[PDB]
Each structure stands twice: as C-alpha cells, then as structure tokens.
C-alpha cells in the first residue's frame, strides 16, 4: 500500500492511494485504501491525510477524515495526527484489544505546507519532498 498527498505551487491539495490489499485475504475483501475518509481524505480548505496499518482498523475509525477534521478544529498537522491516534488508542482498548496487535497511523499536510505523522506503534517510515530535498522520516508513536 502507498498513500501520497501533495501541495502544489498553486497551494492546492490532492491525494492518491492504491494497494493490492492484505495478502491471501478473502475474495472480495476491501481495505481502507479505496475508502474516502479512511485510507485517504483531502479538503482544499483544511488539508490532507493518508493512513497506514490494518485496513480494517482504519475503516472502523475513519481515521484520515478524523485527522483532517481535527486540523479544521485548529490543530496543526502533527497535533491532529497525534490526537487522532490517542483517540483510536482508547477505542482499541475499549474493544479489549492489545495495542501490540494493531497498527494505525497517519501522515498529514495543511495549506501552509506544514505536515505531521503519528502511529500507534514504532517501526513505520514515510517520505517527504520539498525545496529541502527528498528524505525518509519517522513519525511519533503512542506505544512506548
């Protein structure tokens, strides 16, 4: 799975998300990648975000929309990603599930070019490309 969000020279946002899904999944199974507000969501008035992790968990939590909406509430891209994860962390615990068996994270971007990234668990990485160059970065995580 690969999720990508971008802000062009015009200050416009856009995003793409495409995957083959979970290997050896049931036939007809759909993950978060193609669901708007789950694997990806874009609002040229607030910002954008794309997810990572178990598609089943991202769908039930509508994470990506949650992140963008939180940015609409005044949160910076990073605070929105962190706040969204911490909320899903509670939801997970509510379901009596161990944080070690579930991963859900996001990378966000706002109209000012500001971005964020946060996940439940450590180990994920993403790529950022601006006038500073192309680089691999690590996000923040709740499990620690």
């Amino acid at each position: 799975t690969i999720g990508m969000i971008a802000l062009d020279a015009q200050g416009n946002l856009s995003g793409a998300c495409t995957t083959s899904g979970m290997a050896y999944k049931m036939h007809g199974r759909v993950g978060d990648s193609p669901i708007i507000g789950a694997g990806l969501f874009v609002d040229n008035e607030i910002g954008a975000a794309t997810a990572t992790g178990h598609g089943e968990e991202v769908i039930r939590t509508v994470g990506t929309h949650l992140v963008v909406e939180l940015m609409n509430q005044g949160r910076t891209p990073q605070q929105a990603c962190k706040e969204a994860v911490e909320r899903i962390v509670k939801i997970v615990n509510r379901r009596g599930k161990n944080l070690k068996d579930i991963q859900v994270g996001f990378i966000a971007l706002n109209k000012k070019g500001e971005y964020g990234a946060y996940c439940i668990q450590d180990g994920f990485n993403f790529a950022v490309h601006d006038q500073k160059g192309n680089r691999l970065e690590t996000p923040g995580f709740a499990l620690k």
């Binding site: 690969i2 062009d8 995957t19 036939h27 490309h129």
Partner: protein, 140 residues
Amino acid sequence: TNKPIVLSTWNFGLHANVEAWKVLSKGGKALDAVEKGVRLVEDDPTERSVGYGGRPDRDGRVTLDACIMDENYNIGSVACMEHIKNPISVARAVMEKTPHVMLVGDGALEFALSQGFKKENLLTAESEKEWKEWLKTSQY
C-alpha cells in the same frame, strides 16, 4: 508557506516522491503529481503490495483497490478490480468521466476497458509461486 511538497507512505515513497516532484517542481498540478507518483509503485513488480506484482487473495486473484481526491472536492475510487495495472488511473476516470465516485468488481473492470485501459496479467510468477507455497502451509 512551504510548497510544493509531497508526502508518501513507506520506503518506496522516496522513489514515488521523485516522480511526483518532476511535476510539482515545474509548477504542475498536485493531482497529476500524486497520480504519477503512485503509478510508479503500481508498475513495479518488485513492490508486491501495490498493483503489478501484488500478492493476490487466497483464491489466487490479484484484486486492487484505489481512490483519488483532487483540490476541488472531486473524488474517484475502485475496489476489488483485476487485470488493470494502474487502478489509480481508472479511479481518476471514474471521477472525471462518471457520474459516480466508486466502482467495484467486474463493473469497475468494464468501465476501465471502456476507457481504453488494457487487460494485463498482474500475477507475477513469484507471487503465483509464493501463493501456491502458502496454500500448502495454509491448508486452504
């Protein structure tokens, strides 16, 4: 304001970022940059988590999922579509040439072929082999 700028998921995103930058760095549309960016990972058979070369379902079928969102609230998505190497491009066609926003299964493949998209064998030998090896240790 920091722009342009591209964000990609996982390691292969670094290479996908380069493809998107070629567009963004020249003042190109963000929609065209993100589409081209992920398309590279779809065309790469070495990346078995996206498009071509992707690992199929238990039945051995490679079904792809993809969605796209532009700067004007236009959206497009396809789920459980097979035989089309670039599902992100077919999703853009759904958004641009369809009064709908989401297509799935054969109907999604039907529209794709109706737009000129070509039928291809996404199941690589490696992916086909590993799947057969799975079936054994899986008992399915």
